Amino acid sequence: RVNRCIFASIVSFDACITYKSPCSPDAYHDDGWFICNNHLIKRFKMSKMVLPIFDEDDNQFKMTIARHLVGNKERGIKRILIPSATNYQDVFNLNSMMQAEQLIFHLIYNNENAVNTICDNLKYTEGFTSNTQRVIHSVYATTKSILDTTNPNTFELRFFDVTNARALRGGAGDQLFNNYSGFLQNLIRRAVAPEYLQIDTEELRFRNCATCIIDETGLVASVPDGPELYNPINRLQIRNVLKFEGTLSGYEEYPTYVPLFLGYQIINSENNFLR
Partner 1 sequence: KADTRQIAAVVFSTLAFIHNRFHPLVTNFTNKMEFVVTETNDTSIPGEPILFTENEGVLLCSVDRPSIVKML
Partner 2 sequence: SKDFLQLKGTMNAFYAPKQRILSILAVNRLFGATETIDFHPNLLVYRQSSPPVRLTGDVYVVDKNEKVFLVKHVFSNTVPAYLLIRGDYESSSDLKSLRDLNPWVQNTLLKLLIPDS
Q: What are the residues binding partner 1 (CB under 8 A)?
A: 234, 236, 238, 241, 243, 245
Cβ 41 to Zn ion, closest distance in Å?
11
Cβ 242 to partner 1, closest distance in Å?
9
Describe the crossing of helices 133-150 and 182-191 by its angle, rounded to 10 degrees.
60
**Does the footprint of its own copies cover residue 271 (CB under 8 A)?**
no
Q: Which of 1, 2, 18, 244 binds its own copies (CB under 8 A)?
A: 18
- Residues in the chain after which the chain is broken, C→N over 2.5 Å: 155, 233, 246
State the Cα–Cα distance between residues 252 and 248, nearest whole angstrom.
8
Residue with smaller CB distance to partner 2, 17 or 241? 241
**Does the footprint of its own copies cover residue 122 (CB under 8 A)?**
yes
**Does the footprint of Zn ion cover residue 100 (CB under 5 A)?**
no
Angle at 160 between CA 158 and CA 166, to 5 degrees: 135
Q: Which of 121, 145, 256, 268 binds its own copies (CB under 8 A)?
A: 121
Kindly identify the residues of this chain, within the stretch 27-46, that bind Zn ion according to CB under 5 A: 27, 36
State the Cα–Cα distance between residues 83 and 139, nearest whole angstrom.
22
Q: Answer for the pair 174, 223: CB distance below 8 angstroms, yes or no.
A: no
Q: Which among 120-128, 146-154, 176-184, 198-206 is the span making contact with its own copies, rule CB under 8 A?
A: 120-128
Residue with smaller CB distance to Zn ion, 23 or 81? 23
Residue with smaller CB distance to partner 1, 166 or 243? 243
Q: Answer for the pair 136, 104: CB distance below 8 angstroms, yes or no.
A: no
Contacts of 66 (CB under 8 A, 6+ apart): 40, 44, 46, 47, 48, 49, 190, 191, 192, 259, 260
Describe the crossing of helices 112-122 and 133-150 by its angle, rounded to 10 degrees.
160
Q: Which among 16-24, 56-64, 145-153, 170-178 is the span making contact with its own copies, rule CB under 8 A?
A: 16-24
Q: Tell me whether strands 218-220 and 80-83 are parallel, antiparallel or unpaired.
A: antiparallel
Residue with smaller CB distance to partner 2, 169 or 243? 243
Identity at 91, one-letter amino acid code = V
Q: Which of 244, 251, 254, 273 binds partner 2 (CB under 8 A)?
A: 244
Q: Which among 100-108, 158-166, 236-244, 257-265 is the span making contact with partner 2, rule CB under 8 A?
A: 236-244
Residues in touch with its own copies (CB under 8 A): 12-14, 16-22, 78, 93, 95-97, 99, 121-122, 124-126
